[PDB]
Write a protein that binds this DNA or RNA. Structure first.
Length: 72
DNA sequence: TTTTTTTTTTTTTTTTTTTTTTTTTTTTTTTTTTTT
């Protein structure tokens, strides 16, 4: 299976109406220096719509999440 | 024959019903082969 396991007991995954799984895949670079990181959010549970609808996006330091980058 | 008159005091306990929680990695090992 998957060795990784969250902390804080397992009384929270029953009540949690929706659980995300955020991971950092790559880093965005302006030539040589890094400005942001490539995040990959995966919905591992959901009580309001089908689960496992993993969605990827890029977040820039200071400027926040890159809404425009993913809209295009 | 007539002719009623006045209450007094507490004694005793009886029985338990129910579980609720995980949490943490740890470690490298060993070369092979001259070619003209």
């Amino acid at each position: 299976g998957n060795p990784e396991t969250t902390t804080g007991g397992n009384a929270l995954k029953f009540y949690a109406s929706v659980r995300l799984d955020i991971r950092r895949t790559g880093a965005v670079k302006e030539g040589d220096e890094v400005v942001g990181s490539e995040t990959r959010v995966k919905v591992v549970k959901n009580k309001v719509s089908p689960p496992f609808r993993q969605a990827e996006f890029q977040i820039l330091y200071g400027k926040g999440i890159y809404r425009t980058g993913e809209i295009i």
